Design a protein around this ligand. Structure first.
Ligand SMILES: OCCOCCOCCOCCOCCOCCOCCOCCOCCOCCOCCOCCOCCO
Length: 350
């Protein structure tokens, strides 16, 4: 009865937001309330330097997609070109690191159910980049604390410190791929110095408000709270997917995607991050746990949902990694943490 629809609108990021809040969500919410459409969600993605808003919805009626297109044209005005903004960019049913084919329904469920939150977040911070960054800081800090008790017990013991290790691992992992790691880190560190006195007490307060991460979270800011309870509601189903052999974390290469003696001539000393990589390299158990423990795999899938949510809110790579870096540094200084020492202490229990 219902047919899967998929519409992509290739316009600048800021225009995607206007269309979403002023044209697309009111139309699609109305269509849902009338039963013309079953449900909908949106993604924001990019192909070849052409950002686009994706609207995905199941509807019996061909009119819904057509009404959407025609009202998008009315909103933007005759300035943009209709024959260029609707170039179809095909939906990926097998997104990297999102659980594989068997995980698609759960991800689409999650996106549908968090679409009101995403829209409310955009509306509350419309035209206010600093407020939207603060909102993102809030739910990212809380997510690392909330997920910690669902980790394998040998890392779940860390509590909120497992949030620190997570954001640090994400940042340092990307440092291994880039052209100038030391120059890029220096710029992030410069940014932390400017914001340290604001970030550290904000972070400690969020962690305190997350002290019972299984509870009602009544002191957490409203938008973060809604994010946390919804993601946490999905954790059992994330865990069940892996436990039952259905979910797998992988990437897929696309169609036709091919795949001196410093120790002596030294006079700059060891980087502090080198101690951290040595720590991981020496901890075989930790390595296996990250790759194969099903509670960790479920955590990584919730991690991917969190990253997708940043992207649905319009945070591009630079902003996302700034947030990860700022959070990690603030954890590190506020609680006097030693990542190498924490990594070294992860051992099998019993
Ligand atoms: O790695 C290379 C990245 O470079 C970009 C590669 O190509 C870009 C492709 O475009 C996609 C842009 O959109 C981003 C959408 O994200 C896709 C899904 O991401 C997969 C997983 O991301 C891991 C990074 O997570 C950041 C958010 O972290 C949330 C906090 O997690 C809490 C704890 O999670 C792990 C538990 O760790 C315990 C300690 O070890």
């Amino acid at each position: 009865t219902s047919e899967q629809k998929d519409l992509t609108v290739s316009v600048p990021w800021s225009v995607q937001e206007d269309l979403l809040l002023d044209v697309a969500a009111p139309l699609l919410d109305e269509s849902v309330e009338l039963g013309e459409t079953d449900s909908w969600f949106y993604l924001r993605e990019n192909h070849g330097g052409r950002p686009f808003l994706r609207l995905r919805f199941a509807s019996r009626s061909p009119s819904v997609e057509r009404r959407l297109k025609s009202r998008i044209l009315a909103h933007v005005g005759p300035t943009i070109d209709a024959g260029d903004v609707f170039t179809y960019q095909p939906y990926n049913h097998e997104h990297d690191w999102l659980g594989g084919t068997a995980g698609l329904g759960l991800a689409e469920n999650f996106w549908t159910e968090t679409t009101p939150l995403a829209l409310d977040t955009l509306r509350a911070t419309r035209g206010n980049r600093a407020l939207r960054l603060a909102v993102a800081f809030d739910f990212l800090v809380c997510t690392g604390v909330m997920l910690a008790p669902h980790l394998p017990p040998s890392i779940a013991k860390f509590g909120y410190k497992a949030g620190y290790l997570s954001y640090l691992a994400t940042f340092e992992g990307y440092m291994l791929l880039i052209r100038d790691p030391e120059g890029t880190r220096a710029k992030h560190a410069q940014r932390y110095e400017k914001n340290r006195e604001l970030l550290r007490p904000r972070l400690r307060t969020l962690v305190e408000q997350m002290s019972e991460p299984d509870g009602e979270l009544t002191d957490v800011p409203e938008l973060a709270r809604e994010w946390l309870v919804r993601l946490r509601d999905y954790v059992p189903a994330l865990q069940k997917g892996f436990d039952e052999g259905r979910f797998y974390l992988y990437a897929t290469p696309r169609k036709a995607e091919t795949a001196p003696d410093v120790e002596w001539l030294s006079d700059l000393p060891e980087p502090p991050v080198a101690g951290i990589h040595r720590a991981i390299a020496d901890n075989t158990y930790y390595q296996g746990m990250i790759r194969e423990d099903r509670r960790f795999l479920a955590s990584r899938l919730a991690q991917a949902y969190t990253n997708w949510h940043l992207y649905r809110l319009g945070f591009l790579l630079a902003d996302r990694y700034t947030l990860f870096y700022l959070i990690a540094r603030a954890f590190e200084e506020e609680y006097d943490l030693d990542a190498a020492a924490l990594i070294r202490s992860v051992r099998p229990e019993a």
